[PDB]
């Protein structure tokens, strides 16, 4: 019984932890290039920031799916 | 309880349509008016050139 | 000779070198020498 | 909520408005033989645009139109421009294809912005009106379109069109052919498993896998949407619902994106199939 | 705003004035130029150059070889 | 499995039914673009 | 029996999480050079949204596939 | 019942792991190819064709892993 | 009994790997940041402002995970 | 009993993980190759030729791994 | 029995990924720092200034993991 | 009896695929940079090709050793 | 018990295992960039090296601390 | 014993295969830059190759050490 | 207790592994830039090679520590 409980707890940990890593990496990769671009073109900064926000929202989708399912397992406690 | 959740959803949609009005309408409206005006300009140019 | 003179600081800003700085500088020296020759031709024509 | 959680467990994971021919129609049987009987809702939702554009087709003009007609010609111009300037195969009805499939996947993902729970708490009056309530308590209330079988049908339809072209460019012999840079092995059994089997599965599964992926594109995205809506359902009053709104906004932004790239890749396959070898 | 652009050859200049957009074919990357842009230098393809004033007009100059600062 | 096949076949029929109208709508705009060209030609002739 | 339920729960958890990771890295790889190119040619906005859309579609192929079937397991464990 | 969870985990590996591989690979392709077509917009289409060629080049074996996972899920070739 | 160590190690995984993701992401960020801020020293303040923007936008999910781990420790679920 | 599940797991690794190797390496190669052809469009033939050469040099180990895994799937040892 | 080893491994990995992240993030910071200093021999003080400004920003969550690990070693969980 | 057989098989296969990355990535990096070199100076394509083989013969040996050990386990694993 | 003793040994080993691996890679990248810069700056060797020693001391503090904890466990294993 | 026979098999696979990547990745990273240098410096190639082999031999010491450890475990395993 | 023998054997394998990876990967990182710079500046080859040795040994220390711990535990396994 405790086996299944440990399984679901570990699964919940999985879902948030890995997605956090992935979004961190995507964030850093965009940040370096975004800043270097702004350095290159210090002028058109608004739509640069705009595209940056848009693709940033594009990034986290499936990781947010994962975190949602993790909290699903936390509170709804499926199969528990 | 049920009413509470449904009212929460309704308040949510109120905030949505508040932001939907504020943010979504202007670009579409401006593009529509601009093309209508420019097509009118093309037609007027045709008429002027005919005359 | 004014290549080490007429200067007082090295600018913290600099250009990025889309081609190799070496070949870029080489092409530069090419143009500079050609321009020098050209103006010398002009001057001697005036002297004539 | 807890009983509401049980009702949610029963309700949303339903199949085709819980319909099964030659059997019952509200609680027939878990995973027994059945057919799709919710796609018609989306079919009619598409007939809605069919009439909305028959409006402009009959009310067609060369001058300045009304606002809605102007926006319609916006979209038509935009989509036609995109499809044509991207690439064209045979100039045979491809653009209407692309535009209708665009707006369909658009809408078919779109409706999900509505609440999951308003549909049953309203249609309970109709359920008590006709055809029982307890199987409705199990699962009989309509759900915004979330079956993948529609995606499977669309994907296979595209694949059939691909096959029709591949025989109409007659490249099927070369289409079976493939590029194999794996001719040798240093040992006997590995070369034995190399020559025939490796390249055979290679030429088999490559193009087969893609439409499957496309159908599951549609399904998984739209499914992720419904599940986010589902998790929003909890916290009946202690929540302020102020954080579901931003995700909903983001999801809206997505909707267009997946629909667009879907009809893109549709065009891409049609192009490559319409090309030599 | 705009910013000064000077089209100068060894014999003489060709065009001068303050401008806000420029199109140029670099030794490597093609380059678009705007005022305030980070200082840069590169070699240029021997092709034409397009420069865009704020008056809704864009000049053209045909160049064979040269460098951009 | 049956619903899969019915969705397949039935979506295509609807698309086929709606095919003529999209093309008609698309052509009806190119004429507006044509007028500007005609006006330019008339100016050139003038 | 419940042990195999936890087994499939873990399979699905790691499945969806790995999909999230792959997407969260691929999107970043795309966006970096996307912003860089935008910085290079501000005028080419239409083609660059075009290509970026194309590639973003080409990217996510397997991840949310496994996501979908894993959640299918969550609702219908594909076994007893 | 143990073998069932075993093969379920195995299929999880089979598809997700290649999913990582494909996602990162095509991400790199997109970045580099995007940079390139920015460099010569004039050379976009044939380069896109090249890209499609290499896309077909890469995706072969990940699809194989997906197919193996599907085969196992539909019919485990075991108890 | 085993659930104690199980949830404890789940929390440890969450917080530790979140630390990994943060640290390495900020390292990647800071590299190109140092590059750019060196290239254009005059923009340093507004560059810092953009850095603050992305810094906030960056590591929220690790904070979520570490908080959930701490709840799992003290206000333990799965009991 | 369990031996079948372990053999399946091993085969899944054998095919999937080298599928990563092919995916990632081909990703790098495709990016660089497209860069190169962007440099010299005229030299595309020899570029493609070198690409075929190196890719063919690559896949041998993946071929071995996937063949061995398929052998287990059809004819496992340690029955 | 088991819970003891569980919490031991939990604390170990806590500190272990903490240290991994710290080391690699520091390397990533330093590389670009040093190359920038080479290009700009002038502004080394303010570069170092911002460098520590962001370094202190960096090791935060790793320091949190350090605190968690030390607490676990001294004041463990339930068992 | 399941223990030794299953573990031997697992170890052999992981040896193999883990080398699969070894060869794949090492060769991928080498080939990418070779392509860069031939892009710069296509003249030395065969000389750089020679150096390429010089590296190819140098990168692959240990993975081949792992392959042989795995095959030894497959045919006659030295164990009980 | 002896299971737990082996587990504590596992933990103590594994801590310094990652610690050494991460510190080694961090010095690897950091020093590689050192060689780059100092090669580009043959005269700036002393000040650069001073910074190098500062940052190298700054790098592996927490790693050496974890190593000390591992040795503490090796001599005095707690949680017996 | 069979339990621990498999355990020894696993540790051996760790050592051997793990060295396989360590060497393969080190060699690929070496060779990429080496080809770069050959491209830039088609004259200094001899000493280039000498330093290359010097550092490469400096690399694979601990890898071959692990290989010897693993093959020692294969033939004449310890803790018998 | 054989289980504990497998435990500690696997732990030592991990230790020696991580040392090997640090050595190989860091050495490749250094060598890339070493060869790059020396091809750029063959003049500074003695001084820069000196710094290269200065940092190479400055890298692998804690790797060697882990290696020694693992080797000792092979010879004299603690906690028996």
Residue numbers in the entry:
A (entry chain O), G (entry chain P), L (entry chain S), M (entry chain J), N (entry chain G), O (entry chain H): 1 to 80
B (entry chain p): 2 to 52
C (entry chain g): 194 to 241
D (entry chain a): 15 to 291
E (entry chain e): 2 to 70
F (entry chain b): 7 to 52
H (entry chain Q), I (entry chain L), J (entry chain R), K (entry chain K): 2 to 80
The authors write:
State 1 was then used as a reference to build structures of the remaining two states. The central stalk is rotated by almost exactly 120o between each of the three conformational states suggesting common stable low-energy intermediate states in bacterial ATP synthases. Structural alignments of the γ-subunit between states revealed that the three states differ by almost exactly 120°.
